[PDB]
């Protein structure tokens, strides 16, 4: 049914505009699959875990923004900016939906595992749960406005 | 005819932007079906009632936002935010269209039934009717700006 | 040709955003047909007149907004807001395109007929003509900003 | 390739939003064809010249806006606003792309021919050239902000 | 999978809006291919290098904007504005993604080669790397706000 | 039936010879279609209005003949003669048939609209109606012989 | 559509009768093609330029008529009359239509090139432009009646 | 017909031998297409302009030869020779054929545009025209022997 | 049989090298057809006369070379060299083969006709006949070395 | 096998260049057939003898060159040079290969028969035999450099 | 397209003649493939690296020529000349094109790797870059004429 | 692949030109086969040995050239020149490639066997080895210039 298309378009558009308005990194960890088999593939099976990948992107972006707003350094040569993959000292927020929870809970486990084994603390993670993917952008807007949050990770599953 | 696509795109886009601008929950209770049979399925028959589901999402989001803006509590561990399913003390607004009223009136009945049996009062419900789905976003904007409204529910039916 | 899609997307999007920004009703009276036969059907023939329907929606919305911004009344029960279908005292603006004028002039006749027989005056109607559908949103923006206009009706014909 | 779709969507969307923000007429003179033969048809051959048509729309819109912001006149009857097709005293800007220049230069010739034979002067035309269609909206934004420009004409060719 | 469409739509839309808001040139150097073979074709092989083309567009736009904001000159004739292809004295920023790095690094080489052989210095190039195409718009927003950057080049590869 | 061919041949031949004998411009505004759908296309719909086009040709020819019979001017270079598109001061005659009046009246409206918006007066238009296309040439001969008529426009519809 | 046949028949017939009545050479430089590809072939491509050929015929005919009306000479043998291909001292008029101008302007360039490189002057060429092929015969009649014109060249493009 | 093969073989062979004998750069800007559509593609349309590309090659080769015959410099490392893309101070000759002039004139425009916008002067360009591609090599031999010419550009169109 | 290919390759190659060695124009007037019908087409019938075309090329090249070796003139602008089509004062040589003489004699007639009617004298034409196409290059070498010959025309017919 | 092509190309090319370098006639009497039957046809059977034809060409060319280098004569009219078919006083050389000698010896007989019956002497014929067609050009070079040889005849047979 | 054939023929022919004229080794390291897949196969993948092979041939030829021009030695037996594969003391030049640089840079790496690991120095390698394969022969001619160069390596990629 | 054609064309062309320039016999002993089976057939199997055949041709040519440059003798009759098949006193050079050495070494054995059994000495044979067929012509040029070499034999194998 066409119900799939309109929800997917608005969730992706909402998160993108929000990141530019607040000038803070927000990572897209939402699965958009045509079949149930395709979704299981990406939820901790032969095609990996999308929750793990989204967390890794957030860590890099947080370090990159710390570098851009610093001194930068270097001189007499091309300046190159890049982000490390160390999570020590960073604080993260996660927004997850409850629909298709059999798959979503696998993605949330991956995101937490990535942060901890790269040097982060569970005490620095804030987790917010919403009833559906439609409510992710408005909930993400509340976390992104907090001063002590470095990046936000959005997780959900949509099946056509 | 392509008339279906343009109306559906603008209604979904309008409600999404409105929720982010006013920072208030708005739930998507609009059916978008390809055939008449598919619409009857979701209007109180073998595939459930979409009006009931939209009301349940609104109740949860209202409680969640009450929790985020409070003290929060907890410490020395991962903070988790979630919303209960009790409607005592909450105030709701509903916007419904008149086209395909044979189906829409079934969705409005479900939304009211959900609120009352979860502990709400009919005195706390405000209902606004508009001639069509195109007029839902502008009407929803008037309710969302009232200080004594906690969440808004949008209901409509579109058939290709 | 794909020329049809881009014009249709921008006209619908422009009018929708304009209504939310100015918080005034704007009705969508634009035909979007795949064949010439489908267009004649909706221009005063076996499938009705879209110009008549758009005017009827404008009258209802104007009365509804008068009711929301008033006292409202009622008490100890569910508040219900709805609009009458009387046009006495209301002032309307119309924006119409010149392309496919053989069909557009039938839609403009229907809109004027609806307003007059529901109790309106021709003296209270302002009509603006533009060369094409692409120019409708910018022209509609000038009328919507006038203080003595209650609603705007947009009329046009697009054929793939 | 899908490269065609994304460029076409952004160019049309950019020009539409720009016209509403600055409240000035901007005309869409961009060809969007599926085949090379379809493009030659509309570049000064059996299906006319799109550059000529875009210039004619600009002249009408400029006169219409002069009329709306004037006294208006009339009374005791329905007010009708329309634009003449005389270009005496008007000042125009043109933005043209360089890709597919074998066709684009035919469209620019048509636009200049239309303005001159309707009573305009070549001294009142400002022409800006950009490397591609993607750069049209940003260049059009510089011309539209000048106080002595009445309307802007955008010209380009895209082939799937 | 539909994952390709939503990412491509948001990246193109984000860059377009950013250029209009900041009124600075931003060039679209992102490949959007249906097959791996189509991508290799445009990454330094029989169909050229898209990184080279994007850099050439940036140089022209930078010179054009220098000309518009200057005196302009000329008189008693049609004013024509155009940009040279000399890069002496200009300063450029580049944002590149890490996904499909086997192809992306070919595009970055082309962009640097174009700038140097047209008269630019490597000391005037700032390069920022991001984990994926989704993060390009937010990173591009940081460079575009610097006062000593004349234009920004965005590079990435997406394969359906 | 072959009835279509003989009428069409004689009407076109009659008007052509008449223009050469009297040395005055006469424009061919007669539709010759194979199907009813083809005729509606050219009578104010997706393929334009033939009545508008015929009037535009008459205006140009009238100005051109005023220029040829004047001084001409210029020297030491190639002489070029062309006609403007201003209708101020010109006087026009129109001959229209009554068969297929549902379509013919759309063409007559277009011709009058073109003349007025290019600067002409309705007081300077003479309209003659004949029962059929066969009678157009003899009626056109009476108007063309008047001293105060600058050009004649012939309008009709023939369907095989 | 049969519209092509009637216009083509009248234009060819008009020019032929005009040449016999005034006893002056008139050359037929009008393309009559069934497809767009056939027209491009004869407008300066693999099948030559019809504008060049028409000018060459005019030069020969002008010299031939100068020879017939002279002494003739010769005796006691068969008299043979023929025309040279030198354009020194001759004066030419050209009538060209504006429809399908993308092709017509190529034919006019060829005609001027032929005259100049055979020894003629641009100062001796008079160029008249008309809105369409239907108006060519009446315009050609004005030039042919001038005493200082030796031959007339008619140029146009018609596509079925 | 086999006429295409023999002309193409001799033109390419002639230019190649000439460049080696005189030890001066000569660039191959001749289109060799199987169909008319393929030729239009490369004459300023979706596949670019071959005249522009040939001029760019000439500029690079001229700078490279200036570098080889100079000091060279560098030491204790691999010597690398390359040419810049600045045209300041260079002098160019162009040889163009007249057959298929509708396409050839587009290629000549591109070559001149490239030279001027890279810093060259029109005063430093010498243009020679020949009746056909067969005559290009002998004409190119006269320009290449002049002492004040740095490179030669050959332009033509051949269609099988 | 393959006999056709080897003769055609050597005749074309021989004439091309000869023109470069002696630096004198030589024109290729040899028909290379696959069928007898194709040859008759080009020997004075619906596809013209190749002997006429070859003579016209020789006249232009002779005038061009007279211009290059002269003063040239012009200044402060782009120098353009081109050849007139006047044959007064020029001297020509012709080499023709005897095989397929039924067709060759038609080509020789055309070449002589072209020269005389453009202003040349028959007294200035030298005609040499050889038994076959294989012997054309060696015979052409004797004429090209004479000081009082301006250009050479080669004529022959080969059929596969 | 492709062995046939390379030998045939080099033998024909070698003889052609040799004739131009030494400025002496050399005739091509080599059969190039696809099948054995085709070769027997041309070796003294229903399609004639190629050895006879090559000798006849040599006789004509020898007389022609005697005429060109003489006085020439004639005046006040077109000069025509041609060769007789008398062999009295001429001296000839023949180079023949040994491969396929069953056919080659028939060709050598024909060449000698032609010379004798046209008035030549066997005492004036020099015959050189080589092992194969590849060795013909080098052997022909030794004969052509002798002062008392007027023309050379090359004979061989190649079968694919 | 046939463009591939003519470029390939001239590049191979140019290098071959150059080696014989200067009597110095030149190696053919140019890939000529029908498909992109075939080219990747030979650019450092399952079918090896053509750049490595060309360098190995150059080393052997350089040693062989050193041996031929020396004493030679040996006696009373068959003399055999052969080249070692040691690169100590030799000096090499490389000419490489820029088109299809994604593949060409792999070939240049292989050539340098071969020379160094066989005992050569990077200080003894001269590298020249040209815009395309057409320019390789003229650039190779400049290196081959230097006294301190032992062999030249030509590298390029052409794809049909 | 087309790689086969270009190498084969240049090797055959190089050897042919070399023989004419130095006026010394050079024999073509290179196999050009389409399949591996065809090559084994000609390398000492059912279709003979090409190395043996090439040596036999060299012996004959060496004796023939000794006869031409001698007295010649004979008189009062047709002079006939031919070569014996005795190798006593003659000196030979051989150039062989290393690619496909499994087959090439069979051809070299045949060439040596032919010379010895016809009366030659192994002491009079000089053998030069090159890495590939491309290097044969340049190596053959060094041997052919030695005064004490009577003929050269070229051996190689190419497989499509």
Author numbering:
A (entry chain C), B (entry chain D), C (entry chain E), D (entry chain A), E (entry chain B), F (entry chain AA), ...: 3 to 162
Quote the passages of the study that discuss this structure, keeping the authors' original sentences:
The cpAaLS(84) assembly resembles the AaLS-wt cage, where each pentamer interacts with five neighboring subunits in a dodecahedral arrangement. The atomic model of the cpAaLS(84) cage revealed that all the constituent pentamers interact with each other in the same manner as in the AaLS-wt assembly. The 2-fold symmetry interface consists of a hydrophobic patch (L8, L141, and W137) surrounded by a hydrogen bond (H41) and ionic interactions (e.g., R40 and E5) while an α-helix region (120–131) forms 3-fold symmetric hydrophobic clusters (I121 and I125) in the cage interior. Irrespective of the tested buffer conditions, cpAaLS(84) did not exhibit substantial fluorescent changes up to 110 °C, indicating little protein unfolding.
As such, we found that a circularly permuted variant of a cage-forming enzyme, Aquifex aeolicus lumazine synthase, cpAaLS, assembles into a variety of hollow spherical and cylindrical structures in response to changes in ionic strength. Cryogenic electron microscopy revealed that these structures are composed entirely of pentameric subunits, and the dramatic cage-to-tube transformation is attributed to the moderately hindered 3-fold symmetry interaction and the imparted torsion angle of the building blocks, where both mechanisms are mediated by an α-helix domain that is untethered from the native position by circular permutation. While the wild-type protein, AaLS-wt, self-assembles into a ∼ 16 nm dodecahedral structure composed of 60 identical monomers,35 the negatively supercharged variants AaLS-neg and AaLS-13 adopt expanded 360- and 720-mer assemblies, respectively, constructed entirely from pentameric capsomers. Moreover, a circularly permuted variant of AaLS, cpAaLS(119), forms not only ∼24 nm and ∼28 nm expanded spherical cages, but also straight ∼24 nm-wide tubes of variable length. We previously designed two circularly permuted variants of AaLS and confirmed that their morphologies depend on the positions of the newly generated N- and C-termini. The native terminal amino acids were connected via an octapeptide linker using genetic fusion and new sequence termini were introduced either between residues 84 and 85 or 119 and 120, yielding cpAaLS(84) or cpAaLS(119), respectively.
